[PDB]
Design a protein around this ligand. Structure first.
Ligand code: NA
Ligand code: NA
Ligand code: NA
Ligand SMILES: [Zn+2]
Lengths: 234, 110
């Protein structure tokens, strides 16, 4: 169970002087999703490549997902899986040179769950409650939904942030109404962990480095997990 | 084919109208740019992009947003057009030691 955040542990939007649209982009109606797929290639030992086509625009037909290490990649390599995650293009590479354009490809981290046995007994959806706190006050609550019994924290996070962009302007093109924000997951066994929702200080926002946190492919039990989003203003 | 196409080429907007300028390149360069011309002077950078899903503020970003939804397309958005935004706008795409410009968009905000 991760130590809960102190205000000094949290990134401040007032200290980010770039374009918040670059963080918005990663969560606003934006995700890779595929059902019942098996990996077709690898670049490095810790990554897997899938044949997944873009279902919003026509930006890619292959997705590279990077895992924490080669043992995690080996876990999923020959499995029939489902995939859900936030993808990026800037510095999405398949060789040692940084800024090469790889047409037809996109990149992400984690987002993989075994397909077989991981669905509810009628194609049914599972609701997961998200309680939102603004300056310590629970002002808004809603559910996100998943088809998965074991679901990545990444998938739930993306769904929560997408909703909050739409209903609470969590991220806007220039900045955010909020100074700090973190999303906290509470598991049935008492285990807790959280992710900082705001970009690192300065002018640039490195989308790849931000999303790398999902590379642990952390999963939670959708039937029992609880989510809280804690925001502060100004 | 034109390296960079802009649309519309001519636009008359009323104050407070939402105006979107589209720029479509054919060379699939990583970098794209939106400029406005200071009458009888130089080009001033509004927003630019290093790739799909990225935009960055130039020298005069206020009043404008931008979107890079695909390698080929970079949109400039005036969410609420003001008379001060009356101008000629030029899109550019660049990379691999090249820089190409669109033929310009004349926008008038009455
Ligand atoms: Na799994
Ligand atoms: Na916005
Ligand atoms: Na904004
Ligand atoms: Zn499945």
């Amino acid at each position: 169970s991760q130590p809960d955040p102190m205000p000094d542990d949290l990134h401040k939007s007032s200290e980010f002087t770039g374009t918040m649209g670059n963080m918005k982009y990663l969560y606003d109606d934006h995700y890779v999703s595929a059902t019942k797929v098996k990996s077709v290639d690898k670049f490095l030992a810790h990554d897997l490549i899938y044949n997944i086509s873009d279902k919003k625009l026509k930006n890619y037909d292959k997705v590279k997902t990077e895992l924490l290490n080669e043992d995690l990649a080996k876990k999923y390599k020959d499995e029939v899986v489902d995939v859900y995650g936030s993808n990026y293009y800037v510095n999405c590479y398949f060789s040692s040179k940084d800024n090469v354009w790889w047409p037809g490809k996109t990149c992400m981290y984690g987002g993989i769950t075994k397909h077989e046995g991981n669905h509810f007994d009628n194609g049914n959806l599972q609701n997961v409650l998200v309680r939102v706190y603004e300056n310590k006050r629970n002002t808004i609550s809603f559910e996100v939904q998943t088809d998965k019994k074991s679901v990545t924290a990444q998938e739930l996070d993306i769904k929560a942030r997408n909703f909050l962009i739409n209903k609470k302007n969590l991220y806007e093109f220039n900045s955010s109404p909020y100074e700090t924000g973190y999303i906290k997951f509470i598991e049935n066994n008492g285990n807790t962990f959280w992710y900082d929702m705001m970009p690192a200080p300065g002018d640039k926002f490195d989308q790849s480095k931000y999303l790398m946190m999902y590379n642990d492919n952390k999963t939670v039990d959708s039937k029992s997990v609880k989510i809280e989003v804690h925001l502060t203003t100004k | 084919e034109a390296a960079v196409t802009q649309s519309p080429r001519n636009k008359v907007a009323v104050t407070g109208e939402k105006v979107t300028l589209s720029c479509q390149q054919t060379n699939n360069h990583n970098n794209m740019y939106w400029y406005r011309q200071d009458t009888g002077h130089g080009l001033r950078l509004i927003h630019y992009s290093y790739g799909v899903g990225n935009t960055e503020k130039g020298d005069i970003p206020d009043g404008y947003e931008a979107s890079r939804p695909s390698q080929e397309q970079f949109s400039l958005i005036l969410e609420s057009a003001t008379p001060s935004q009356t101008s000629v706008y030029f899109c550019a795409s660049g990379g691999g030691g090249t820089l190409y410009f669109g033929a310009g968009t004349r926008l008038s905000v009455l």
